[PDB]
Symmetry: D2
Subunit: 136 residues, 4 copies
């Protein structure tokens, strides 16, 4: 139900023309209260000058999937970005399968906080970690 709702949201992105189109290749794995797990295969359209996952796209995945985890919350408010931090620990090479897990850490009347981990699906090793503060 909630999962189906989100899957529809992700389905829409594909055909969309705004910046959300960039997440067209992601696939939904799970959706639970305040926790969303997506997956994606790195393709050329996802790479930087040197052939690995572009930090800007990692940032984009942190931003949107974080909002998704927020949507799967009781209040369901998406919110507006305030601050975002991203630590890059290991490159994600072309053809690599990545797992994106978003956690709503806490949310109050006006502020929501989330944490997103990207990991190498095959190794479980951390690729990057983002923290997102949103204004509700």
């Amino acid at each position: 139900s909630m999962t189906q709702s989100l899957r529809e949201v992700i389905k829409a992105m594909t055909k969309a023309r705004n910046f959300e189109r960039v997440l067209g290749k992601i696939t939904l794995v799970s959706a639970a209260p305040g926790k969303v797990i997506c997956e994606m295969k790195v393709e050329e359209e996802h790479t930087n000058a040197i052939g690995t996952l572009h930090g800007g796209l990692t940032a984009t995945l942190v931003d949107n999937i974080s909002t998704m985890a927020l949507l799967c919350t009781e209040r369901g408010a998406p919110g507006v970005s305030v601050d975002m931090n991203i630590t890059y620990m290991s490159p994600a090479k072309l053809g690599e399968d990545i797992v994106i897990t978003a956690h709503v850490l806490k949310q109050g009347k006006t502020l929501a906080f989330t944490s997103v981990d990207l990991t190498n699906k095959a190794t479980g090793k951390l690729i990057a970690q983002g923290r997102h503060t949103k204004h509700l």
Copy 2:
């Protein structure tokens, strides 16, 4: 040729297939040692669900133009992202002209640090500010 090189990098993005394709609409204003200034007009392809500049694209702009500022130094190495923080203070609306100003704060043997400001060209008011730590 500092200015000409960046001139070439931009033209490339216009037809690139990787993620940098999303920046093809940016134009170079000036290149100097440790400081690059680009401009861009927010259009539908750069917006979020609510019609304003997408936070992930702002992160993408910070990442790349920050890298351009480092290409304009005696070492000229782009480096790999280690950390990126972004503060969103005011939205950029569709049709709005934005200025992306990037400058090198400090670069050592293996670590370089940059700061990048997006501003409304008209008002000069701050849109977002990002700090970038890169490994060389």
Copy 3:
């Protein structure tokens, strides 16, 4: 051994003249590879002007306890700060017992990344969360 060694390191803090003296009240709960848990009861010396745990002390707790986790590693290199980001979600009040948990997220040849959570011991509620990048 890892625990005995850490207990000393902490004991030396109760007599220190440098900034580490500010943590003389923390106690060691457990030490494990890449993971250190400490506790501390909030006293006046730990509070800001309004009577809650000072944001600067939280930041100091993150820096040092993150360093202890890094010591409980094969390389055992403490490292020097490069980046730190802290998100404050709920106040820690005077008299409150807090738990400081630190995890080594990843460590390379020259860069180490940690995560440190402060939580209310009684309710397990998250107080603040820090991400630490260190140069080795």
Copy 4:
């Protein structure tokens, strides 16, 4: 305004809470949304290797950032939401540092600050922090 804020700092020298760690700072100037303080590095400010402790730099960013906020029309201190600090070069023992805070933007409920520590003699950046407070 400067003289006023100067009193707030005199307290820290006497206070028993965590603000006491800032007793050695001195005020240079205070203006709307901008405060400049200075501090000589001494043993009480150092880490295990003998340089300015990262946690104190964090405390300095937090507090002085707040000062700039108190110097605005609204004058509200706000409570911390997020803080980020990039450490670029060590502040050595005996070294004189300058802490410069600027209020970047402030709305109805959220305020944004930026604080630079620099070496007074060389003007070299020691560390830079951004602070997001909830008003």
